[PDB]
């Protein structure tokens, strides 16, 4: 994106995978939102 400084080895943090990838997640793809429902 445009917020990856220093630790810019990975671009897209797949929260579903608890890790980021050098590209989109090979399963979940890009991450548009976090599935964290507040209650
Ligand atoms: Zn994933």
């Amino acid at each position: 994106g445009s917020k990856e400084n220093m630790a810019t080895l990975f671009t897209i943090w797949c929260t579903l995978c608890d890790r980021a990838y050098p590209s989109d997640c090979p399963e979940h793809g890009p991450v548009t939102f976090v599935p964290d429902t507040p209650i």
Side-chain angles (χ1 to χ4, degrees):
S2 298
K3 299 177 182 296
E4 293 68 57
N5 259 209
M6 298 179 300
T8 180
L9 186 64
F10 300 107
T11 177
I12 300 173
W13 189 270
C14 185
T15 52
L16 304 319
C17 285
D18 188 61
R19 68 175 299 201
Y21 297 91
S23 191
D24 309 80
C25 173
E27 205 282 269
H28 298 98
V31 183
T32 52
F33 75 107
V34 295
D36 279 84
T37 45
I39 175 177

